[PDB]
Amino acid sequence: AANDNNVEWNGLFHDQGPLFDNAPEPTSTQSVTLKLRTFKGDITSANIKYWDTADNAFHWVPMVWDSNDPTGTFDYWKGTIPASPSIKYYRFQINDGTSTAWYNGNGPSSTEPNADDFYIIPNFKTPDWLKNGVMYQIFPDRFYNGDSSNDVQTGSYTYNGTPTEKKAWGSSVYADPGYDNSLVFFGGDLAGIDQKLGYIKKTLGANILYLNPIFKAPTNHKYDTQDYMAVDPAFGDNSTLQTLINDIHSTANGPKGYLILDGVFNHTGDSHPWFDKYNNFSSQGAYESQSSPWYNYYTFYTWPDSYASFLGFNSLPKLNYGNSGSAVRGVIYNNSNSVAKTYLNPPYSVDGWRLNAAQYVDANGNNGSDVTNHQIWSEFRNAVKGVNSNAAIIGEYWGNANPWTAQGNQWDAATNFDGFTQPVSEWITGKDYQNNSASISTTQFDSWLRGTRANYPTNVQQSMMNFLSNHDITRFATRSGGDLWKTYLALIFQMTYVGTPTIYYGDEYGMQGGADPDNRRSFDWSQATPSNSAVALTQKLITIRNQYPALRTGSFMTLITDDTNKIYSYGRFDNVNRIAVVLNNDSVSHTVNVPVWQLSMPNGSTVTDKITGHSYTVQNGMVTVAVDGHYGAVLAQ
Ligand SMILES: OC[C@H]1O[C@H](O[C@H]2[C@H](O)[C@@H](O)[C@@H](O[C@H]3[C@H](O)[C@@H](O)[C@@H](OC[C@H]4O[C@H](O[C@H]5[C@H](O)[C@@H](O)[C@H](O)O[C@@H]5CO)[C@H](O)[C@@H](O)[C@@H]4O)O[C@@H]3CO)O[C@@H]2CO)[C@H](O)[C@@H](O)[C@@H]1O
Ligand SMILES: OC[C@H]1O[C@H](O[C@H]2[C@H](O)[C@@H](O)[C@@H](O[C@H]3[C@H](O)[C@@H](O)[C@H](O)O[C@@H]3CO)O[C@@H]2CO)[C@H](O)[C@@H](O)[C@@H]1O
Ligand SMILES: [Ca+2]
Ligand SMILES: [Ca+2]
Ligand SMILES: [Ca+2]
């Protein structure tokens, strides 16, 4: 490069990784020094332009040359944004004589962007254990039956007139004639999860557990809460939970663990005493009397049969949050004995909450996604972080969750359906997560990923829950048509991408399953071993991620987007390691020239493909590697 009235886009780069930002999560008194990469001697000047919410105006910070990279190929320009409590957004203006280019969260541009600027949110922090960990999601009744004495039996009880049905482990989840799909129980419990912590924390290596609802409720999914204060008898008792938590946090069965519970706060079940639609309690619930002490906890359009609920489901009456200080906000998060604080405080001390249907939480029966909804989650954060600043808050949202994360006053992250699950599914399986035909090319995949990462602050990105499948969508192995190699490819991407890799129980061995409830099959333990190829790969990838901080918090740079051969390559790097991932989404092998020079991997240096174990030497800035179809390479040094 040179001063030739032309800014070379390929040499430009910046994100909030270690090499380019010295304060990714600054407090009110910490200044932020940023570095912009360009090819060596390519430009004449660069400036940081940032919007300050403190005064609703743009501010200018001229950059100065700082240094070259070890290969002498690039220059690093530096600039510092002053310290203050205000949220700020920034982009770069890069000049080389008569040539000008812009750069922000969405990469380089000729015209000045008006969206996707990088974020600076003083005092906003997301749990570092969440950024660096691997999550394992468990649907309680379907994981492991550690205590058959608490098993729900066929006819143990009835809900809305229908008796419960017990089914042999491994059998179909579909209820037999006369029974209901939501009242089918296999026996999985908390004791079981406890006895299997070794498999989770050692055989696989995950250190974070996320459980679906475990509080008293008549159904098998239990999102129709009957009593937030009690673990459901089928799963054990509150004492069992205390022990499970202690064993999760313990290091006697593997690395220190963390527990995240599912918080169903938008609604209760219709059998909850506050509502009591079937009169299961002597007390008078809202449905029973307009004089009920909990009458105002819900919203009736025409008492008592027409009331606000989740998506119109009468079994899930929607909670009325009212105004700040209300009784509902009280029992949900403000009170010391609220659902949120009770489990965050000892004797429980869980590590976080996954907020079910978080977008709908509101007052007066409204549908959320409004000022009140955001105000509520703001108060929720103050409540949670006040008890444990290291407790995670992950909201359920299938789209762009920027509104609940970008101001640093609500969630730490969200279920990454839009920035991970969907794009990964359409690129690799040619199906959306509902198993409908929907395919995207490699260039679309890369653009989709970048655009969605840009929706969030960096710490949020690193904390997103990235799962291949979950209890609300079809199994990845089913969308892939049973081709285990597609699962291999997906796992390699998952474990090397930005965000918390999240494994939906069973996905590690290729469990299949269609739409709810077939996506909640009981776990086949004969597959919970390295003998199973997908399990062996999962364990290896988790070891790799744990071995390289660059994969968890390092920078992300696109390297190759080949639509003809379906080759996708990107690099993850920091001050210590440089890793170039090469994914082959084609059905045939391809020999790829990986441009590792972009990550500043020195010519003559060696790299090791952590997948095959083969080593290569960097030559002419490249690493030539033959990658098998529906497989990948993780070239690290
Ligand atoms: O027989 C006719 C009917 O059969 C089939 O559907 C019926 C089901 O088989 C029945 O079990 C019954 O379903 C109701 C549930 O019993 C009741 O608990 C309630 O459940 C709703 C929903 O709750 C959760 O969903 C959460 C999501 O995970 C989350 O993404 C979202 O944000 O929040 C949701 C609420 O917390 C469970 O996970 C999920 O599994 C449950 O579906 O309501 C159910 C619907 O009334 O009745 C069904 C009647 O349709 C069959 O599918 C249907 O076509 C037939 O007409
Ligand atoms: O800022 C004023 C000058 O800016 C421009 O020159 C830049 C170069 O573009 C940049 O590469 C860097 O050059 C240094 C080089 O990287 C390093 O290897 C060498 O040892 O020292 C060089 C100079 O320090 O920094 C200079 C700025 O000093 C612009 O081209 C020039 O006309 C401006 O005067
Ligand atoms: Ca130039
Ligand atoms: Ca049991
Ligand atoms: Ca009653």
Give CA–CA dist 232/41, Å, rounded.
Answer: 66
Radius of gyration for the alpha carbons in the chain, expressed in angstroms and rounded: 26
How long is the chain?
A: 637
CA–chain centroid gap for 329, Å, is: 26
Distances (CA, A) of 379 to 329, 339, 508: 9, 14, 37
Phi and psi (nearest 5°) for 524? -85, 100
Q: Answer for the pair 388, 344: CB distance below 8 angstroms, yes or no.
A: yes
Distances (CA, A) of 372 to 186, 382, 407, 487: 40, 16, 15, 41
Q: Answer for the pair 198, 192: CB distance below 8 angstroms, yes or no.
A: no
Enter the tokens of residue 70.
Answer: 């070890």
Tokens 């490069």 map to which residue? 1
For residue 104, the cross-strand partners are 107
- The secondary structure of 147-196, three-state, reads CHHHCCCCCCCEECCEECEECCCCCCCCCCCCCCHHHEECCCCHHHHHHC
Q: Whose CA is nearest to atom 13 of ligand 2?
A: 41
Q: Answer for the pair 358, 395: CB distance below 8 angstroms, yes or no.
A: yes
* Burial track 194-226 (b if 16+ CB lie within 10 A, e otherwise): bbbbebbbebbbbbbbbbbbbbbbbbbbbbbbb
Q: Whose CA is nearest to atom 21 of ligand 2?
A: 67
Give CA–CA dist 477/21, Å, rounded.
Answer: 39
- The secondary structure of 258-320, three-state, reads EEEEEECCCECCCCCCCCCCCCCCCCCCCCCCCCCCCHHHECEEECCCEECEECCEEEEEEEC
Q: Answer for the pair 273, 318: CB distance below 8 angstroms, yes or no.
A: no
Q: How many angstroms is the resolution?
A: 2.1
Tokens 């290091």 map to which residue? 251
Q: Is 65 in the pocket of ligand 2 (CB under 6 A)?
A: yes
85 preceded by cis ω (within 30°)? no
Task: Provide the experimental method for this PDB entry.
Answer: X-ray
CA–chain centroid gap for 394, Å, is: 8
Q: From the CB of residue 385, how many other CB atoms can be counted at a distance below 10 Å?
A: 15
Cβ within 8 Å of residue 122, ≥6 positions away: 26, 27, 28, 30, 83, 84, 85, 86, 87
**Sign of the Cα pseudo-torsion (40, 42, 46, 50, in order):** negative
Q: Is 73 in the pocket of ligand 2 (CB under 6 A)?
A: no
Nearest ligand (C-alpha, residue 192): 4
346 preceded by cis ω (within 30°)? no
Cβ within 8 Å of residue 162, ≥6 positions away: 179, 180, 183
The secondary structure of residue 381, as a DSSP letter, is H
Distances (CA, A) of 112 to 58, 102, 107, 506: 13, 6, 11, 46
| Spatial strand order in the sheet of 631-636 | 555-562, 567-573, 578-584, 631-636, 606-609, 615-617
Q: How far is the CA of 79 from the centre of ligand 3 (A)?
A: 20
Q: How far is the CA of 463 from the centre of ligand 1 (A)?
A: 29
Q: Whose CA is nearest to atom 18 of ligand 2?
A: 68
Phi and psi (nearest 5°) for 365? 80, 5
Element (H, E) at 485: helix 484-494
> Can you state the angle between helices 533-547 and 484-494, rounded to 10 degrees?
10
Q: Tell me the domains of the chain and their CATH numbers.
A: 1-124 (2.60.40.10), 125-547 (3.20.20.80), 548-637 (2.60.40.1180)
Task: Tell me the three state secondary structure of residue 504.
Answer: strand
Element (H, E) at 502: strand 500-504
Give the up-direction half-sphere exposure of residue 268: CA atoms within 13 A in the CB hemisphere. Answer: 27
Q: Answer for the pair 114, 161: CB distance below 8 angstroms, yes or no.
A: no
Task: Tell me the three state secondary structure of residue 458.
Answer: helix
Tokens 């009235």 map to which residue? 5
Task: Residue 560: name the closest of 539, 583, 528 by CA.
Answer: 583
517 preceded by cis ω (within 30°)? yes
Q: Is 503 in the pocket of ligand 1 (CB under 6 A)?
A: no
The secondary structure of residue 91, as a DSSP letter, is E
Atom of ligand 1 nearest to the CA of 316: 19
Give CA–CA dist 25/120, Å, rounded.
Answer: 8
For residue 625, the cross-strand partners are 592
Q: Answer for the pair 411, 401: CB distance below 8 angstroms, yes or no.
A: yes
Q: Whose CA is nearest to atom 12 of ligand 1?
A: 182
Q: Is 226 in the pocket of ligand 1 (CB under 6 A)?
A: no
Ligand 1 mutation target, pool 137, 139, 172, 221, most atoms within 8 A of CB: 221
Give CA–CA dist 474/624, Å, rounded.
Answer: 37
The secondary structure of residue 497, as a DSSP letter, is S
Separation of first and last alpha carbons in the chain = 27
Atom of ligand 2 nearest to the CA of 68: 16
Phi and psi (nearest 5°) for 430? 75, 20
Q: Whose CA is nearest to atom 5 of ligand 2?
A: 44
Tokens 């740079």 map to which residue? 557
For residue 89, the cross-strand partners are 51, 119
Ligand 2 mutation target, pool 3, 36, 37, 44, most atoms within 8 A of CB: 44
Enter the tokens of residue 66.
Answer: 């700082």
Nearest ligand (C-alpha, residue 1): 3
- The secondary structure of 38-81, three-state, reads EECCCCCEEEEEEEECCCCEEEEEECEEEEECCCCCEEEEEEEE
Q: How far is the CA of 285 from the centre of ligand 5 (A)?
A: 6
Q: Is 532 in the pocket of ligand 2 (CB under 6 A)?
A: no
Give CA–CA dist 568/527, Å, rounded.
Answer: 30
Atom of ligand 2 nearest to the CA of 42: 9
Q: Answer for the pair 608, 637: CB distance below 8 angstroms, yes or no.
A: yes
Q: Answer for the pair 568, 585: CB distance below 8 angstroms, yes or no.
A: yes
Tokens 């909670």 map to which residue? 319
Distances (CA, A) of 113 to 101, 118, 306: 10, 12, 48
Q: Answer for the pair 20, 60: CB distance below 8 angstroms, yes or no.
A: no
Strand 352-355, strand 258-263: pairing: parallel
Work out the burial of residue 65: count CB atoms within 10 Å of its CB; fewer than 13 is exposed, 13-18 middle, 19 or more buried: middle
The secondary structure of residue 251, as a DSSP letter, is S
